[PDB]
RNA sequence: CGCGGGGUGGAGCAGCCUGGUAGCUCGUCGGGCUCAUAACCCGAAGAUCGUCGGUUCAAAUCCGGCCCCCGCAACCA
RNA sequence: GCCCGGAUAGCUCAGUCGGUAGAGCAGGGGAUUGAAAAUCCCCGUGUCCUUGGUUCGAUUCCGAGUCCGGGCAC
RNA sequence: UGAGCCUUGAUGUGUAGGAUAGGUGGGAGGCUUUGAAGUGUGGACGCCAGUCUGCAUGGAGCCGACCUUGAAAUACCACCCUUUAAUGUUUGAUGUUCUAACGUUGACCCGUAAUCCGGGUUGCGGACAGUGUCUGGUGGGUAGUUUGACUGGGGCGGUCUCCUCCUAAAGAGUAACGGAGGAGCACGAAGGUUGGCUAAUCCUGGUCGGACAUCAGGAGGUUAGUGCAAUGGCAUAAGCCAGCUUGACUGCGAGCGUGACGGCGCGAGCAGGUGCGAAAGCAGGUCAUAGUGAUCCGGUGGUUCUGAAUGGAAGGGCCAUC
């Protein structure tokens, strides 16, 4: 007769706020959840959310990874959120727009993205 | 094993059931630790060691207690009159086809044996082992089936129970009352572990005792330290 | 030592301990020997059984 | 001297272990695209397995002889 | 000659506590591009090795033997 | 913090079923300060609303028992598989902290006029390094040795055992890196026995193999066959087919060929039991000669034969065999 409801196996830690990191680049996003203190909660990416190709580089890839990483911290109760925005990529709004429709309050989107003061050379690509 | 009811509990700690204790005294206690307000059954379970893996291989039969079972194989005589009038007289609870039948299909049944000639049989036959808290089918497994029911019934009254191989490897067979002595039931008990030693297990030496535990219908049981000669043999 | 047909025994059928010894191809017929032989220990013809197994 | 390996469609390679089985990349020819060639695409053709014999029902294959190509060896006082 | 441990989609593995035949890649068709490299799609196949056995039914759960792979033997 | 052993507590969501189906016996119910139940509040909780249940409250029944569905039926006590927390318990694994063994080729004093060495204080390190026994790896640093004969010199090459033909001289078959070929197994029928039958090849006719299937006729007369090499052999077939079968027997064995010996070959007949055949008779492997391995050592099974004081047993012997 039974036929499923519960999602998984019952919740574990419990932390009730957090961070997620969305680092944002030309071919490939990666949203990583963390608590306040500095330790990794879960993660997904859009690569790892089965697009490749040229998709894993779109604003419609960035969001389908968000929801993909929501569900995988849901085992640790968290309702509230603060988002770091990380790099030139597309997806990066598009990213935090996929976590307020997830049901998460963001607190701040601190664009975090990392810049030399002058510092170390860049590669020279695309040359002549 | 017995309930968390607040009684239960009390009960369970002043009766001092389950664990460990020798074979003359276990069965005079267990008359004393009753649960039941009228007359206990009581059972052994016998652990043979080596072949748990096949509920046909180790030892199954029947064996004589010198005090017949009362409550516990209580006896009926399949037939609609096959040399019927000896077993029916004999003290038997039932001698029929008709009502043991309907009875078995429809499911449950609290009775041990109704002993059945061939033709018996033939007519309405058994199905499964999978028997769980019910106990009630005759089969070749027991192999005591064979084969007149005024023997078996009367033999049953003078001293006859049955043995099994269950898939655990434990033998569970029914030793007696507590209406019985401790003698008594001591008395059954000893010749159910000679019955086990005396038939012999196929790659086992003897009544090969991991652990024997005698049980009574609600009191509990006591686990057995000796192979029942006596109470130590050296 | 020789060929792939290899050695068996051949168990008296009797109870007494007694046997032949004989080689067979294994691999082309696997199909065990029956076979009447003389055992001189019951003295007399018996089958013999089997092929080097329990 | 001698010993061992080799002789495949126009080219280079595979299959060679008591065996019946012809495969790959180039090149070739026909059609196509292109102003036209190149390339690119599709289709096809091409070896009676060095040569002679023997064993075998059957041999490129295993066996023997000869020619041809390669590797090693042809010393010791 | 032992103890081990494996024998399935073509492959490696595996949903397979007995109630119930899959993931990854392999070949065909469709869908697009300087055919292609490369997206996305729908089929890919097994009496789970041959035989015993528990059972309400079980391949696997308990067992005997063939082949592969790993030890100690001689 | 692993694991074992073990003390108490526990889950098992199939198909049908109200739900509850870990295997299975007992068993007609269990009533301290009740046993209520029941609605309510939280927790665990997973093949999802399905179990257990702290406890507010209530002192006013769970629920089987043939109450019903289903192979198994439930309440309720045993039994014990899985998973398993609580915890007990021994031991391991790990870290940190300690100092008292232990190091100190740290310092300072004293013996001392040595300042090596010992003793003292004190600092630093510390159950680690160290060293002994055990043990896996590695180890030409070191050592003791080994590394064929034949051979038209010897090295290279070939070859070493066993069968068949020639050389081999019309009994024995006898050399040479003389000439030429093979074997290192197969076989439970390819053995036994009764019964039957007869070959390569070519021609002629022949529905597509018209170069060669299957067929029929004729000639031929074995030119074939022979598990595999060659020599011998064979029509009464030792060839080919069919039926029943396990003499591919156990004990011996006169007589003998043969070899330096080891050993190898051969066999009438006798005793036991048997197969085939009406019987005589036949059969102790294959039509013969290749298809192999001395001894020690060790293995498995059998055997009163023995088994270091008596009785048993490891062990040894004999027999079978690896």
């Given at each position: 007769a039974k036929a499923p409801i519960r999602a998984r196996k019952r919740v574990r830690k419990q932390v009730s706020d957090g961070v997620a990191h969305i680092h944002a680049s030309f071919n490939n996003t990666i949203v990583t959840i963390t608590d306040r203190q500095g330790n990794a909660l879960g993660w997904a990416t859009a690569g790892g959310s089965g697009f490749r190709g040229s998709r894993k580089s779109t604003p419609f890839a960035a969001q389908v990874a968000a929801?993909?990483?929501?569900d995988a911290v849901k085992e640790y109760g968290?309702?509230?959120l603060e988002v770091m925005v990380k790099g030139p990529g597309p997806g990066r709004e598009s990213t935090i727009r996929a976590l307020n429709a997830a049901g998460f309050?963001?607190?701040?989107?601190?664009?975090?993205?990392?810049?030399p003061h002058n510092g170390c050379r860049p590669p020279k690509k695309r040359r002549v | 094993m017995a309930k968390l009811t607040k009684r239960m509990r009390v009960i369970r700690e002043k009766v001092d059931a389950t664990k460990q204790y020798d074979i003359n005294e276990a069965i005079a206690?267990?008359?004393?630790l009753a649960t039941a307000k009228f007359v206990e059954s009581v059972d052994v379970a016998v652990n043979l060691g080596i072949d748990a893996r096949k509920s046909d291989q180790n030892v199954r039969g029947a064996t004589v207690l010198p005090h017949g079972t009362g409550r516990s194989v209580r006896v009926a005589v399949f037939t609609q009159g096959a040399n019927a009038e000896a077993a029916k007289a004999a003290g038997a609870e039932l001698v029929g086809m008709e009502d043991l039948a309907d009875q078995i299909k429809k499911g449950e049944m609290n009775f041990d044996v109704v002993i059945a000639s061939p033709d018996a049989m033939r007519?309405?036959?058994?199905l499964g082992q999978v028997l769980g808290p019910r106990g009630l089918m005759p089969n070749p497994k027991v192999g005591t089936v064979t084969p007149n029911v005024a023997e078996a019934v009367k033999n049953a009254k003078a001293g006859q129970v049955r043995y099994r191989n269950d898939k655990n490897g434990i033998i569970h067979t029914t030793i007696g009352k507590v209406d019985f002595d401790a003698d008594k039931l001591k008395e059954n008990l000893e010749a159910l572990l000679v019955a086990l030693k005396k038939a012999k297990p196929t790659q086992a030496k003897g009544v090969y005792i991991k652990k024997v535990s005698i049980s009574t219908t609600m009191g509990a049981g006591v686990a057995v330290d000796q192979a029942g000669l006596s109470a130590s043999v050296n | 030592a020789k060929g792939i047909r290899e050695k068996i025994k051949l168990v008296s059928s009797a109870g007494t301990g007694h046997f032949y010894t004989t080689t067979k191809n294994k691999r082309t017929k696997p199909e065990k020997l029956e076979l009447k032989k003389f055992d001189p220990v019951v003295?007399?013809?018996?089958?013999?059984?089997?092929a080097k197994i329990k």
């Open positions: 929801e993909r990483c929501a968290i309702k509230n309050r963001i607190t701040n989107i601190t664009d975090v993205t990392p810049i | 206690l267990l008359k004393e007519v309405v036959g058994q | 003295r007399q013809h018996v089958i013999y059984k089997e």
